[PDB]
């Protein structure tokens, strides 16, 4: 199947604007699951704060990239093979909980073993590239 | 409450001078508002005896800049633009290294702190440095600007609890209990606003 | 305070003799010296009772030696020539083996 | 590639001089990091005395050696194969955070498999040599 | 031949002791010379005060190193090609211009590229070592 994890992350100017429409960096984690039912369970407050331990149980490993606005970040990951959902979540000032554009779930068929698959960011937002 | 317990009743918080009932003795009124100011310290900030407040934190709301870090007392408050949720801090701790620093993450830097100051009195030492505060927001409404170096500026907004919560521990600086009480000096005065026009001074610089 | 209430008062934390409003009558000055050392460990050691202070640290720099350590009521201090940083020792301590050396 | 991990340190008699001039000891830790990112991120305080289990974690294994003034330790290391850089910190009494001489990373590509790579360490500074 | 100069300079605590015994500091010169002859001509007054522009011609440039009582400063000099003789220069209370434990000369061949020669500075005399 896929062996290594391959993710690139390309970001606008405008992501994470507050209200003076300031420009802010912004923080997104990369998560290992074994269950993708969990991480469709948890809210925006316990996923990044919380104790559930059976959502990070089934976390095999977490990594946490780190990108400026206007910039981009590689991610070369050797994947591990009980990681049958790549979890995103990302940190905005204004994560729309209800309308759910904070997270995607990346399965085992959608990644590439030698070419990266691109996530955009852009405003509160999180899109993804054929 | 002996030496003099027929001239100043307990009152309130503040000490009320007219309860002689006798002419013919004031006293100095440089004595008057230092104990104002002195038992306005004891009813914020020493109401068990043991000497210790504690007043609700900030989070961050930041320009240009992330990663603002401020440790005082083994009471972390990491902050990478998150959502803004506000924290407690007791300010008298247990054993600890006491003190207090601040540090942030510049976009083109490291981490280098703003400055670490130690001692148990260290909280009141480095608080001193933005008096910029007045903030029409939450009731006790408070900011602090915290202007480092290189143009990068860090905001918090500081809600405390009890009367002011422990900015009121920067009356103390340049204070010295006076001279006499009861002195001829000093017949006709009126000096009854300076209790305004420091706050005043204060709330607006 | 009630066995010579009129000839001793408390003030300050010294023991003031001359409110006596009495003559013909003088003490001995060892006692009066003696009383004010003990009054002075009064007001620095013991404030709450429970007969506890606390102390700022001591660093080190040193000349042709290194691993300075001394150990007092389980608060290490080890120091290898770091950047010099106070700390904080509680004079009394809770249960421990309780004793002090220099390594 | 390398194998195993050969570092030769050279000392002055004028190391970590103190406002006497006084010739002082100094304490050198070696780290084998998975990230350099971390490793050039963090001040001098929070390396020898922090809690940075971000920087620790990627520390996969961690060796104090300590050397005389004027004198010489060398480095025999079994070198694991995720340390993709070899970190070298070191703690003056005057250590210039600013200017950043009291650091070096040496990466995966200029170790040598049989023959150890030079540092020397003159006042206050960290050193290489070809 | 040598491309660095390298020079490591100690000293004991008792070094130009004045009439009271006195530890004292002292400042020691570095000559580079294309000539020692007349480095060998000059007494204790005419080199460190005087006009000899035949002795200050023939030397290439001079650098003046400063040492506490009991400490070491190391000194890192680019050596040039046409400095024949490093001329090591001392300012005693009291320099024995006659039996001239004032003054050493090293020449080309007695350097070390890559290791600090070692000057030891005791009482109000200068001593090499091997």
Redesign the interface.
Not at chain 1, 22 to 27: H, R, T
């Given at each position: 199947q896929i062996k290594t994890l391959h993710l690139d992350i390309r970001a606008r100017e405008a992501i994470?604007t507050?209200a003076?429409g300031?420009?802010?960096?912004?923080?997104v984690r990369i998560y290992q699951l074994k269950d993708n039912r969990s991480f469709d369970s948890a809210d925006?407050?316990a996923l990044?704060?919380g104790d559930n331990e059976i959502l990070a149980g089934d976390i095999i490993a977490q990594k946490d990239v780190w990108l400026?606005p206007g910039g981009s970040v590689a991610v070369d990951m050797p994947l591990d093979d009980a990681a049958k959902f790549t979890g995103v979540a990302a940190?905005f000032?204004e994560?729309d909980q209800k309308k759910n554009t904070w997270r995607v779930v990346l399965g085992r068929d959608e990644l590439e073993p030698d070419t990266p698959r691109l996530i955009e960011v852009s405003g509160n937002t999180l899109t993804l590239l054929p | 409450q002996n030496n003099l317990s027929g001239v100043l009743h307990r009152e309130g918080s503040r000490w009320v001078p007219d309860t002689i009932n006798t002419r013919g003795l004031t006293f100095n009124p440089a004595f008057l508002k230092a104990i104002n100011t002195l038992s306005e310290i004891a009813d914020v900030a020493f109401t068990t005896g043991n000497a210790g407040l504690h007043f609700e934190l900030r989070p961050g709301t930041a320009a240009g800049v992330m990663q603002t870090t401020l440790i005082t007392d083994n009471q972390k408050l990491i902050y990478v633009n998150q959502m803004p949720v506000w924290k407690r801090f007791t300010w008298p701790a247990d054993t600890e290294a006491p003190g207090a620093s601040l540090s942030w993450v510049s976009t083109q830097a490291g981490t280098r702190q703003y400055a670490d100051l130690p001692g148990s009195w260290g909280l009141i030492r480095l608080l001193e440095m933005a008096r910029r505060k007045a903030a029409p927001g939450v009731a006790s409404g408070w900011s602090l600007s915290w202007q480092a170096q290189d143009g990068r500026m860090l905001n918090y907004t500081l809600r405390t609890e009890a009367g002011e919560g422990p900015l009121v521990l920067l009356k103390l600086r340049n204070f010295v209990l006076p001279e006499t009480v009861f002195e001829l000096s000093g017949t006709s005065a009126f000096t009854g606003n300076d209790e305004d026009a420091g706050d005043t001074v204060e709330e607006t610089d």
């Open positions: 994470n507050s003076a300031i420009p802010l960096s912004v923080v925006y407050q990044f704060t400026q940190m000032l994560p | -």
